[PDB]
Amino acid sequence: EEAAGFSNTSLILLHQLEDKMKAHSFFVDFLHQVGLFSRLSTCQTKGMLVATRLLLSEHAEKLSAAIVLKNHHAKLPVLVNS
Amino acid sequence: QLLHSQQELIPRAAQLLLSYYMIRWGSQCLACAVPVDLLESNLQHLSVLELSDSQVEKRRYTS
Amino acid sequence: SLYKNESGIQEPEHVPWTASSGTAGIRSVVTRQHGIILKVYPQADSGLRTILIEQLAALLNYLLDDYVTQLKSIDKLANEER
């Protein structure tokens, strides 16, 4: 489809973020169902130990942050794009 | 050629003796067993002071 | 509640991405932000300044909550010193 793009590219990016959130939710639910979410214990990050359940929670938090960041990108475009 | 050679080599011997003094001393000069994140914070404070050579390098301390 | 496991394994310590360790994260930004505040504040009008206070208070509460979460993340039985 891409030669210069169509008129809904911002919406495509937004819905890509939406599907990212949906897939993260599906993965967390999958882990809960298969009992691997309970087995999630820790991993080594930056020299500090983090529970991977917390890691996935932060993944979802910063995915929502990306969504709202695209919202701010739409609302106040010049500074955010700079 | 022996006379000038020894006069040339004596300061060289002095400096090289100093160098391997430094090396042997370093081989026994201990390093503190501290966590990486504390040193990272200290380097961040240095960088706040506008200090170069404050680079952070992930290395694994031995127990 | 979702990212808390059914049984889980108990280990000390955690830092969220918002409270990303080292002052060079959000904290230095906050400090510089206050330093910028104090210059504009005297000439800013009453309502503008006020709104700056409420936003600043929200920011500060978020940060102190980050610190509280980091603290509660630690499980101390031999880690009382740290």
Short description:
This is part of a larger assembly, with two copies of chain A (82 residues) and one copy of chain B (63 residues). In chain A, 72% of the residues lie in helices and 7% in strands.
Question: Could you describe the 3D structure shown?
Answer:
Chain C: This is Nuclear pore complex protein Nup133. Chain C: It is found in: Chromosome, Centromere, Kinetochore; Nucleus, Nuclear pore complex. Chain C: Involved in poly(A)+ RNA transport. Involved in nephrogenesis. This is part of a larger assembly, with two copies of chain A (82 residues) and one copy of chain B (63 residues). Chain A is mainly alpha-helical and 82 residues long. The two termini of chain A are 28 Å apart. A two-stranded antiparallel ribbon of chain A has the order 1-2. Chain A is elongated, with a radius of gyration of 17 Å. In chain A, a hairpin with a 2-residue loop joins β1 (43-45) and β2 (48-50). The longest helix of chain A is centred in the N-terminal third of the chain and has 26 residues, at 9-34. Chain A is built from four helices and two strands. Helix content of chain B is 63%, strand content 0%. In chain B, 0% of the residues are buried. Chain B is an all-alpha fold and 63 residues long. Chain B is built from two helices and no strands. The A-B interface holds A 46-48 and B 35-37, 40, 58.
Write the layout of secondary structure elements.
This is part of a larger assembly, with two copies of chain A (about 80 residues) and one copy of chain B (about 60 residues).
Chain A: H1 9-34, H2 36-39, E1 43-45, E2 48-50, H3 52-75, H4 77-81
Antiparallel strand pairs in A: 1-2
Helix pairs in contact in A: 1-3
Chain B: H1 2-28, H2 36-48
Subunit structure (chain A): Forms part of the Nup160 subcomplex in the nuclear pore which is composed of NUP160, NUP133, NUP107 and Nup96. This complex plays a role in RNA export and in tethering Nup98 and NUP153 to the nucleus.
Subcellular location (chain A): Chromosome, Centromere, Kinetochore; Nucleus, Nuclear pore complex
Protein name (chain A): Nuclear pore complex protein Nup133
